[model samples]
Target: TQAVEAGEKTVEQFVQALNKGDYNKAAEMTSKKAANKSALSEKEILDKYQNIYGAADVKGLQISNLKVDKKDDSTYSFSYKAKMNTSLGELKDLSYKGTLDRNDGQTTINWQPNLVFPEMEGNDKVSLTTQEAARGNIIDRNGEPLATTGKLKQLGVVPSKLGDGGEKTANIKAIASSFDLTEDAINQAISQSWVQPDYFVPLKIIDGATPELPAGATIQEVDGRYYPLGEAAAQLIGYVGDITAEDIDKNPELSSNGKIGRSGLEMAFDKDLRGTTGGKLSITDADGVEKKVLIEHEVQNGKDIKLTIDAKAQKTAFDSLGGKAGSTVATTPKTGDLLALASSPSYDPNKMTNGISQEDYKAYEENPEQPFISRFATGYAPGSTFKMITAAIGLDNGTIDPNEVLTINGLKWQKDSSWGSYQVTRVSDVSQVDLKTALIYSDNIYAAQETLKMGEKKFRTGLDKFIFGEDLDLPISMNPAQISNEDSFNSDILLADTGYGQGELLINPIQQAAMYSVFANNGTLVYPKLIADKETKDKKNVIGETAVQTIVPDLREVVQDVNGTAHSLSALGIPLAAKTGTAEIKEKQDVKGKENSFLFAFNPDNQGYMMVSMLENKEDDDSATKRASELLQYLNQNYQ
Candidate 1:
């Protein structure tokens, strides 16, 4: 309200005039700091402060109801009530308190916001960069890509262009139908949309068919995964698919990522193959345009894998089965290198490549005896295979003398009809037959007695030791799946059943093939290994080797026994030692009417190859024997 005296003055001049008691001159110069600092006569200061004092050009903010108290020797505390009345409303009285200090005629105030100490700094006020991980690859033992990668093409509808009240249902009806959807499914797709702007379209529909993208839908090409060999070894290599809700929660990294292994090797090695993901940082210019990437990190590729399985051997075994229901495992006896592993009724991996549709997938799932379950994974009694383990157990446990010839009463306990119902004079299958002879006739009674004499504890203990399970502590990936119920073994009954590969006894064909190494190798038990060696430019690590190692005494004699099981199955040229298994499975009655036939053998002269076959059932003992003979002929002629 003060009028200037025809001269421009500054706030500094006013402050100077006020300090000098010139209230009149002070009021006139109180426009700005520059105006208050104007050069003027000392006499004019009085007019500056007082002449314009009536209008009160000076500003004074009162500390209402202020209270001051000494907080400490160095400071004093001051607090006051404040009221802020705006056009909106009148705020109630608020008060604040803090320490104050006065120095060189100046007042300083200190206050705290009284906020809780945060767990993290500026988190709520800043944005975070989220990253989606890259998908892994599926490869064979040879490092061949079973599943590859491809670019993804995302589809969505333009928000503004979306009609029908932006309803996904209406959008689906209007758009999805125009592409690939039918009336009903389109309605379902529309009903599923919950997120968004007015007209956002979906990228893909879950558990439903996607219509060929509509015009308004967004199409962003990104990377996608593709399985090359489809279903060739689908169960083994595994498949990749969308992550489930449970998966997302358990593995938060999968929430915004691509597909993950749904089964097989893909699942088994997902973590190993899925490399760490990285991200980038960005900044914006004053004009609000993004400037440039400030940081970046490239992702590492997955490990390349190779297997010990020979494609040729696998194909041969598969072809030999001729689509039968079973599996065959072949290995190098001394080294334990699996040469081939094959299962019949195999599916084409391609069926799962682009992803099998619901109807197509249902056909396989609905079929009982799933085509996906590998028969080798299931166990079967080895019948005579049990004879081999029995021979090892009996000979090693002092149950039977190698040269002793006790007349085996093949009929001593012939009370039940299962005892073959036929009795003959006790002339002797030979009064002098050794433990090896008992193995040869596949003589049920003699071996059964030998097993009984050994007793459960020693017998089970010996069997457990043979497979290195007395106290097993091997890597899970490399360890053999051994037999169970070690403590519950019964000497006579369990031994009797186990003597002929029945009861709770079971063996993987790979284990069987490896077991024969004991004979071919003169008795040492070697760890069965799958990898031969890894190939690289600098180093190749050899995994297994052939060394004529000893496992137990009397193995060669057992194989050479004129009356031994191997003696019967051998050829003059091949000189193979073998113990055939003909297990009676009531369940397989539909196929074999009575037995699950097996033929496991190794040739000493050739010394490298071992074959173990478990043909599910489709033939009785005689037919199985003939079929195996033909297969053996092929092996002897080609393999030897």
Candidate 2:
């Protein structure tokens, strides 16, 4: 190499390794100067690379176009541009100038603080702020705080109030029982030297419901993250946690004090929630004297997320679930505004955010009913709730006439009797079953017959029109609703089963609830909206206006008729339309199976909300119906 090129090569290699985060390689390229006054080392050089670039989440980092000037034959002064990409945008014009010396042909950089940034000098350190930008809070429709800065209930005891002997023992017992703590644990805390007669000794933050208080026990408020809706909407409102070492490696710009999103909306919108951390990058000596300012970045606040969820509606919806292993969804029929997405058996998310005990975590983990699962974000078998979709498809294709009557007798029916002994079944025994009669009774046979008439090719074509396994377009992740494991049904029997929402049909309550919107939307399917800002009124013309209009009155009759499956809910005394279903889960074709109950309800008067509810392993066939009725009654009195 030429004299100038030899020195330039050293500078280029040093910059290259630093830019690539090859800190060891970069550090090795340097020769420690004994006469140098600055306090820096090969180890500190590696640390500075991480301290500077890692904290910035730097990318596309390159140092190029060396402006080298020869100083005698053995010395060279070089300058280069420091360019990189970051979340706050680009740092393109940052420039650095340094010197290097040549011994024989082996060239090495002279260590200096300015090598990291031009402004740094002396025994100075590169200080990157450890504080993170405050994350934005989440709120409901009326701006009620869902996930935000608020207070939690801390259970403590005033030592003076504890009486001697029996009274103190009783106080410890009550505290242990209510807070899920052992007597020995509470006793040990109370026995500490720091405890005084006047001091309020904090035992634990009360996570679950508060029972009767002990004699000396008092609940005090400690400020932190608060969820107003608590267990009612735990899944929808997520939590945050401390940043990990792995997280810093991936996102170098994250503040050392920054917390990461753990689940739900928090995990989905982590970047937007964190925004950007900004501060001064300065050169400071060991004595803390400021030398020069290298970078002055302005802090940017995150986008605070808002939702269409109504706090009251959400609580009521969750409470109505009766702690069953199912989920509930409520939305506006006219506008598709989501009111609630409630998963059953929920726990207070505050416990997770503040702190979770091993006992509490083990309970959630070992419980037979999954409380942590987000039911609303996933799909289920959908049971008879899918009858409406079949009805809409039949009406759209001109395959089945709602007004036409067909003689269908017996509790079960099958074509040619060759397919199987147990093909389609009906709950109601009627001589003549038409579209109206079939829906009122939730006749599985009717749906199966109609789907068969439509044929596999046409049925799939129509079913494909509905959004399946595609962009659900919501912030939360959801698997697409599947019509079957495959695109088409291989067997005619499977097609028959699918007509009654059997086969491999997996539909989430959100989309299932949205499909019901077609009846109210003039044959258009209204997609749901969760985030308030992502809200807009748009739809797909899936069914014919005439067809949707034709089928809606029959649905209302299903609620109004005395023998109707959903007739149990007419006492709510509101103009309502509904469809009820029972889906069977079995190992094989002819075996007994567990059943899931479903109920979908909407107001004929176009009231604010429509809901689809499902309960796994029905305590009774009307489990979903009963829950929906109770919820609608509460909604009638308050929200609707």
Error of 1 at 489 (Å): 2.8
Q: Cα deviation of 637 in candidate 2 (Å)?
A: 6.1
Q: Pairing residues by index, what is the TM-score of model 2?
A: 0.86
lDDT of 2 by residue, 318-369 (tens): 9888888878888876777788889987877877777676677889879877
Q: Estimate each model's TM-score.
A: 0.57, 0.86
Give the per-residue lDDT digits (tens) of candidate 1, residues 1-640. 0212111122223234544444555334221222212223434434433442212122221225655665554345555554432111222354544444433233333312110011111111111243555555544445666556755444555555554455644665666555554546434433565745555544342222344555345554545565554433444555666666566434433433456666666676666555544554333344434454333455545654455555555555666666666677776665666656665556654445333445657777685546666555455666666666666666565676666775654344432364474322221355445655655556666666676777777777666556533222211123344554565653345546666677776666655665555655555554455444632111111111111222122334434566544454444444655666667677642553456777776665676677788777644434233344444555556555
Question: What is the number of backbone collisions in each predicted candidate, taken in the order shown?
Answer: 45, 3
- Model 1, CA-based lDDT: 0.50
Cα deviation in Å at residue 602, candidate 2? 0.4
CA lDDT of each candidate? 0.50, 0.77
Q: How far is candidate 2 from the true structure (C-alpha RMSD, Å)?
A: 4.3
